[PDB]
Amino acid sequence: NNTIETILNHRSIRSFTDQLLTAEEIDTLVKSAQAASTSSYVQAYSIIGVSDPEKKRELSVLAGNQPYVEKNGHFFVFCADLYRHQQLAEEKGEHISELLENTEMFMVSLIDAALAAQNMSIAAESMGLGICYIGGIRNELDKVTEVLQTPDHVLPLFGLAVGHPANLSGKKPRLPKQAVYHENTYNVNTDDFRHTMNTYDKTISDYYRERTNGKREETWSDQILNFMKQKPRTYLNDYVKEKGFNKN
Template identity: 55%
Template structure:
């Protein structure tokens, strides 16, 4: 196993960082690594916003409710961005229809996600810790206003990066046979349930044995609870208001 794969396999979310800030060189290295991610048709349909203003961090923390939004070495926010593409066009009806399509919305969100994962691996290879922050969509309109985003730009998630205050446990992942199917989708529900039941037992042991935030829970129970409550239902209209994913 080479060092890159070791870094990937050793990933864990870090939610407590020291007070040490990233250097400009570290920030630029992480962003340049993000830029080397694959991108659909060379579009590079994303923008990364680094938030250093403490007032803005405080406002984003109020939206998120997670202290590591403000207490970190550096906060990156990844945005799906078709604004620069819009600026380069003749603004014809055909162009507008293309930019506002579901396909281009997918392109922009995938481009941003690929860039973010490159950034994460780069940061971890430098001995830093990371945590993704989807919680910034708890009030996506307010996040948009704080960052002063124009049309065709959507804040997708944050990425808190910094020096870990302590080592955290690595969280288990689903069995490979649940995730990886050959040639077609595996619709053998009985087999899937068997594998997931085994994983539930494993994750229960993990939660009982970890050093902090011990609890009794299963993966299946978490999923059932997640989808039994409607959250962030304003995101759909927000995206359309930003002139994206309209058709």
């Protein structure tokens, strides 16, 4: 069907026209996001739509100079949100902050926000729009919270750049099915692991050779390890706790 074709056709779009999203398109994207399943009906997230040129610019800089954060149809910031729940309880004369600060609630809010974001992404892609997630905002969350004026119990997780593509780019191959999908138990067989990872590394190296006309030939395992041990964002261990999450 058309939905599965749209899902499988996905690629990140990093080049957009200057055509802004309409209020109707933004409305549809937000409603689509909200329609996602939510743990215990908590809906533990918020979406900040950034259209202010100065704020889009600041976020682009904080994200590591990503121009598709400024130049797009709209920039959405997905947040883990337990502030709604804190304030909801204060209205009833209750002061429940300690209950919102454990690892369980941090997992709940991150998963809720991510399911909503992926619904927005599929909805945007079905309309012929392009998307790109922006985790780069996590380089400087203290400054991002100042740009967005987010209160305590609110954690920006990533942005989502949405717009009319100026360049369609191309699809990136995913891990072989047998690396990701396991039947009944997790497959720890070393021979199986080496065979799948060798095959994938060759697929990726060939992909870069083809895409760059021989200019790049890196494997997936070399690429992922190179970037993992770079800007590790260790400050988040304490910073998330400062915002009221994942404590103890």
